[PDB]
Design an enzyme around this catalytic site. Structure first.
Site, PDB file in Angstrom:
ATOM      1  N   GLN A 113      60.139  30.539  33.378  1.00 38.74           N
ATOM      2  CA  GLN A 113      58.736  30.854  33.086  1.00 38.74           C
ATOM      3  C   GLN A 113      58.540  31.499  31.702  1.00 38.74           C
ATOM      4  O   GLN A 113      57.410  31.534  31.174  1.00 38.74           O
ATOM      5  CB  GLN A 113      58.128  31.734  34.176  1.00 38.74           C
ATOM      6  CG  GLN A 113      58.727  33.142  34.250  1.00 38.74           C
ATOM      7  CD  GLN A 113      58.148  33.902  35.437  1.00 38.74           C
ATOM      8  OE1 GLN A 113      58.641  33.788  36.563  1.00 38.74           O
ATOM      9  NE2 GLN A 113      57.057  34.687  35.217  1.00 38.74           N
TER      10      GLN A 113
ATOM     11  N   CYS B 103      54.543  33.028  37.315  1.00 44.90           N
ATOM     12  CA  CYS B 103      55.329  32.808  38.523  1.00 44.90           C
ATOM     13  C   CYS B 103      54.548  32.111  39.651  1.00 44.90           C
ATOM     14  O   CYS B 103      55.104  31.249  40.354  1.00 44.90           O
ATOM     15  CB  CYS B 103      55.978  34.182  38.995  1.00 44.90           C
ATOM     16  SG  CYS B 103      54.673  35.371  39.568  1.00 44.90           S
TER      17      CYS B 103
ATOM     18  N   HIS C 269      55.443  38.870  42.778  1.00 38.55           N
ATOM     19  CA  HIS C 269      56.206  37.727  42.233  1.00 38.55           C
ATOM     20  C   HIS C 269      56.188  36.562  43.189  1.00 38.55           C
ATOM     21  O   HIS C 269      56.614  36.665  44.329  1.00 38.55           O
ATOM     22  CB  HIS C 269      57.628  38.227  41.946  1.00 38.55           C
ATOM     23  CG  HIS C 269      58.507  37.265  41.207  1.00 38.55           C
ATOM     24  ND1 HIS C 269      58.134  36.705  40.021  1.00 38.55           N
ATOM     25  CD2 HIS C 269      59.752  36.761  41.494  1.00 38.55           C
ATOM     26  CE1 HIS C 269      59.117  35.885  39.606  1.00 38.55           C
ATOM     27  NE2 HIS C 269      60.125  35.892  40.503  1.00 38.55           N
TER      28      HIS C 269
ATOM     29  N   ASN D 298      64.242  30.937  42.183  1.00 42.34           N
ATOM     30  CA  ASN D 298      63.542  31.761  41.174  1.00 42.34           C
ATOM     31  C   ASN D 298      63.305  30.913  39.918  1.00 42.34           C
ATOM     32  O   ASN D 298      63.829  29.806  39.795  1.00 42.34           O
ATOM     33  CB  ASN D 298      64.338  33.045  40.926  1.00 42.34           C
ATOM     34  CG  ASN D 298      63.506  34.199  40.360  1.00 42.34           C
ATOM     35  OD1 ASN D 298      62.291  34.112  40.216  1.00 42.34           O
ATOM     36  ND2 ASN D 298      64.198  35.281  39.964  1.00 42.34           N
TER      37      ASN D 298
HETATM   38  O1  LIG Z   1      49.110  39.411  40.059  1.00 45.06           O
HETATM   39  C1  LIG Z   1      48.847  38.365  40.635  1.00 45.06           C
HETATM   40  N1  LIG Z   1      49.805  37.623  41.213  1.00 45.06           N
HETATM   41  C2  LIG Z   1      51.262  37.802  41.045  1.00 45.06           C
HETATM   42  C3  LIG Z   1      52.049  36.952  42.074  1.00 45.06           C
HETATM   43  C4  LIG Z   1      51.525  37.155  43.511  1.00 45.06           C
HETATM   44  C5  LIG Z   1      51.180  36.005  44.268  1.00 45.06           C
HETATM   45  C6  LIG Z   1      50.745  36.217  45.590  1.00 45.06           C
HETATM   46  C7  LIG Z   1      50.572  37.508  46.129  1.00 45.06           C
HETATM   47  C8  LIG Z   1      50.892  38.626  45.336  1.00 45.06           C
HETATM   48  C9  LIG Z   1      51.384  38.439  44.051  1.00 45.06           C
HETATM   49  C10 LIG Z   1      51.618  37.301  39.630  1.00 45.06           C
HETATM   50  O2  LIG Z   1      51.083  36.302  39.125  1.00 45.06           O
HETATM   51  N2  LIG Z   1      52.594  38.020  39.008  1.00 45.06           N
HETATM   52  C11 LIG Z   1      52.995  37.793  37.569  1.00 45.06           C
HETATM   53  C12 LIG Z   1      53.396  39.154  36.912  1.00 45.06           C
HETATM   54  C13 LIG Z   1      53.735  39.083  35.437  1.00 45.06           C
HETATM   55  C14 LIG Z   1      52.687  39.311  34.502  1.00 45.06           C
HETATM   56  C15 LIG Z   1      52.959  39.230  33.109  1.00 45.06           C
HETATM   57  C16 LIG Z   1      54.240  38.924  32.621  1.00 45.06           C
HETATM   58  C17 LIG Z   1      55.308  38.721  33.522  1.00 45.06           C
HETATM   59  C18 LIG Z   1      55.002  38.858  34.862  1.00 45.06           C
HETATM   60  C19 LIG Z   1      54.233  36.916  37.415  1.00 45.06           C
HETATM   61  O3  LIG Z   1      54.588  36.129  36.551  1.00 45.06           O
HETATM   62  C20 LIG Z   1      55.186  37.015  38.591  1.00 45.06           C
HETATM   63  O4  LIG Z   1      56.431  36.807  37.953  1.00 45.06           O
HETATM   64  O5  LIG Z   1      47.599  37.843  40.804  1.00 45.06           O
HETATM   65  C21 LIG Z   1      46.487  38.618  40.203  1.00 45.06           C
HETATM   66  C22 LIG Z   1      45.286  37.723  40.292  1.00 45.06           C
HETATM   67  C23 LIG Z   1      44.520  37.659  41.478  1.00 45.06           C
HETATM   68  C24 LIG Z   1      43.425  36.805  41.530  1.00 45.06           C
HETATM   69  C25 LIG Z   1      43.070  36.001  40.434  1.00 45.06           C
HETATM   70  C26 LIG Z   1      43.792  36.111  39.250  1.00 45.06           C
HETATM   71  C27 LIG Z   1      44.952  36.928  39.195  1.00 45.06           C
END
Ligand SMILES: O=C(N[C@@H](Cc1ccccc1)C(=O)N[C@@H](Cc1ccccc1)C(=O)CO)OCc1ccccc1
Length: 215
Positions: A19, A25, A162, A182
């Site tokens: 990613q 993710c 994640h 992953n």
């Molecule tokens: O933060 C997230 N999602 C999480 C995943 C998730 C899915 C399902 C349930 C709980 C968590 C998410 O996308 N995490 C991100 C966190 C991240 C941010 C910036 C740089 C590196 C990493 C990822 O990439 C997970 O690796 O969604 C916020 C959101 C909610 C509604 C609409 C838009 C965004």
């Protein structure tokens, strides 16, 4: 359910991805699930586009995050069920930004009709996976920066952050385990995979499990 299942050995799982610096993710989890479901419906194993979601699914937040269930709903409600090929819409977000959506010049590689949200129960998730294939899940990955191989113990289980893909399980092992794909390259973990203990809600793995449906 069978004692053990490993979809990696049964033609259903594409290569491990990277990613990069993007918070995408959620898109790797959703697309990996679609790839597997499309194959198990009797179609060729095809590489599909995370970039379509990261740039074009405005119900999620690009490199700032998103939800697999929102992504599955966007595909059906806004994109006519279509998932483009990787080759026709390649990954463009490794530097950490989501470029503007391109609304033509791509080729459909798979279609889905909907999605299902699975029960918050590890035995029920395994039973579904054994018949219908790999499942998108969310985890608390905060302890995953220490993983080097084997079956992890004592995963920090505080807050989901994640999205990843369940590809198998083994209930016959000394410690029963889940097998997880992953998106951190093949140099991480067991050639890009992690095994966590099964039956104690390690890393909150049972809480947000779902899958696309291919007709
Ligand atoms: O933060 C997230 N999602 C999480 C995943 C998730 C899915 C399902 C349930 C709980 C968590 C998410 O996308 N995490 C991100 C966190 C991240 C941010 C910036 C740089 C590196 C990493 C990822 O990439 C997970 O690796 O969604 C916020 C959101 C909610 C509604 C609409 C838009 C965004």
């Amino acid at each position: 359910a069978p004692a053990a299942v490993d979809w990696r050995a049964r033609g259903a799982v594409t290569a491990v991805k990277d990613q990069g610096q993007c918070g995408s993710c959620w898109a790797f989890s959703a697309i990996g699930n679609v790839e597997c479901q499309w194959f198990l419906a009797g179609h060729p194993l095809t590489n599909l586009s995370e970039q379509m979601l990261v740039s074009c699914d405005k119900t999620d937040s690009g490199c700032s995050g998103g939800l697999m269930n929102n992504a599955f709903e966007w595909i059906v409600q806004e994109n006519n069920g279509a998932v483009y090929t990787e080759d026709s819409y390649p990954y463009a977000s490794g530097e950490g930004i989501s470029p503007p959506c391109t609304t033509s010049g791509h080729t459909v590689g798979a279609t889905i009709t909907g999605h299902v949200e699975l029960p918050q129960d590890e035995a029920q998730i395994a039973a579904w996976l054994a018949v219908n294939g790999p499942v998108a899940v969310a985890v608390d990955a905060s302890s995953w920066m220490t993983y080097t191989g084997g079956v992890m113990t004592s995963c920090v289980s505080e807050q989901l952050d994640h999205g990843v893909l369940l590809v198998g399980y083994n209930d016959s092992a000394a410690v029963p385990y889940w097998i997880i794909k992953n998106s951190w390259t093949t140099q991480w973990g067991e050639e890009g995979y992690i095994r966590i203990a099964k039956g104690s809600n390690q890393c909150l793995v049972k809480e947000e499990a779902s899958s696309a449906v291919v007709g």
